[PDB]
């Protein structure tokens, strides 16, 4: 699989999340997260030419933004020039977000909790999220293979 195909699969899952806000601006994200609980996040298109996506997250000090870099077919958080550039990188940007959400499941360092949905997602996708939080073994589930195929297209917990 060449990089272009890998990036396309990563972008298709982004549209299946329900917290991808497209061409949202920096101030538009400030208002949707101004009163949200700490850790509430969303992902949107970066208005910068050197970046594809940007994480807008509500912190205790207020809403902020952190861009996502795409280099050598891997997504990673924006950090210093090579001082801390060997860090967590994944082929899927949803994987990158799910990785950091589960990391802060315990209780600067990024703190993500619950995403800010654009609209109410489908009941099918809501069940998939609840199932993904319980087990990762789709074969051991009493479901028709049509639904097992559905569970594989989105294996994340966020």
């Amino acid at each position: 699989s060449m990089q272009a195909a890998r990036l396309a699969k990563a972008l298709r899952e982004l549209g299946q999340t329900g917290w991808y806000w497209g061409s949202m601006t920096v101030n538009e994200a400030k208002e949707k997260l101004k009163e949200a609980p700490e850790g509430t996040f969303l992902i949107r298109d970066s208005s910068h030419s050197d970046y594809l996506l940007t994480i807008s997250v509500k912190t205790s000090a207020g809403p902020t933004n952190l861009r996502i870099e795409y280099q050598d077919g891997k997504f990673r958080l924006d950090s210093i020039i090579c001082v801390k550039s060997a860090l967590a990188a994944f082929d899927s940007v949803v994987h990158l977000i799910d990785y950091y959400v589960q990391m802060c499941k315990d209780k600067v360092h990024l703190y993500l909790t619950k995403p800010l949905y654009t609209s109410a997602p489908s009941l099918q996708h809501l069940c998939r999220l609840t199932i993904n939080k319980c087990t990762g073994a789709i074969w051991g589930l009493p479901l028709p293979t049509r639904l097992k195929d559905y569970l594989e297209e989105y294996k994340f917990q966020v």
Binding site: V26, K30, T64, N65, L66, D78, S79, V83, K84, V108
Partner: peptide
């Protein structure tokens, strides 16, 4: 810019 963050030690 002003409302953006980078990761730093």
């Amino acid at each position: 810019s002003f409302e953006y963050t980078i990761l730093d030690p």
